[PDB]
Amino acid sequence: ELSGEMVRKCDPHIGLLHRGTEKLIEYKTYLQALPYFDRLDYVSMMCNEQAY
Amino acid sequence: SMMKWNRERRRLQIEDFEARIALMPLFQAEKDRRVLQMLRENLEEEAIIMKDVPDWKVGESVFHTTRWVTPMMGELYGLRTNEEILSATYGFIWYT
């Protein structure tokens, strides 16, 4: 919501990239779920692997 | 540097103005002779053009004073060709 160019309200609408990773992981083994974390933060991949 | 150059330019402008002043009397003489000749030609052609019209005095002054009044553009080039009228009117303004 902009009053001129001043931001009165900022409402982030997300889910346009919601691919259901957490649900898809439940149907795959622990090894098969590892590549899913590479795609979570696709700018920092190997860090996501380390956390998993 | 700009001070020196501007002073020199002022001297050059003064010299050009002096040249214009020297040339001015001849131009004034030519201008007055040309204006008088054009007025005479207009009067002569008017004497023929409006001879039939009743009560039309030819060359009648429009002012009460018996003094020289510089003629307007329409009083000099009134019956000249359109090209000459356009020149003498808008030539300096339209020349770029």
């Binding site: - | 001297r11 050059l12 003064i14 010299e15 050009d16 002096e18 040249a19 214009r20 002043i21 020297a22 040339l23 001015m24 009397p25 001849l26 004034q28 003489a29 007055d32 002779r33 204006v35 008088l36 003094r67 020289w68």
Partner: protein, 100 residues
């Protein structure tokens, strides 16, 4: 051509030109100074006649240079000006008027 010889023309034809200007600026009527206007042209023609007889070629070089520039500047033809002044100072004895 007039601008090239203007400085010498003003000095030599001063007397008849000034009389005509005084007439025009006192009569305030062009028809009362035609005779003085005629004497301006006669003296102007006589001024150029002397140039043609003593400084023909150097003067022709001078005004051709001036004619080239669109502003008809005097500072782009000082070399030709000196040639014209030198001949005129010798053959005719005229001296160009100073500044102002």
């Amino acid at each position: 051509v007039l601008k090239a010889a203007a400085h010498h023309y003003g000095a030599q034809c001063d007397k008849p030109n000034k009389e005509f200007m005084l007439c025009r600026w006192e009569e305030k009527d062009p028809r009362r100074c035609l005779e003085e206007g005629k004497l301006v042209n006669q003296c102007a023609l006589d001024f150029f006649r002397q140039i043609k007889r003593h400084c023909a070629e150097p003067f022709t070089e001078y005004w051709t240079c001036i004619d080239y520039s669109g502003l008809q500047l005097f500072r782009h033809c000082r070399k030709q000006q000196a040639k014209f002044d030198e001949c005129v100072l010798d053959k005719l004895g005229w001296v160009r008027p100073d500044l102002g």
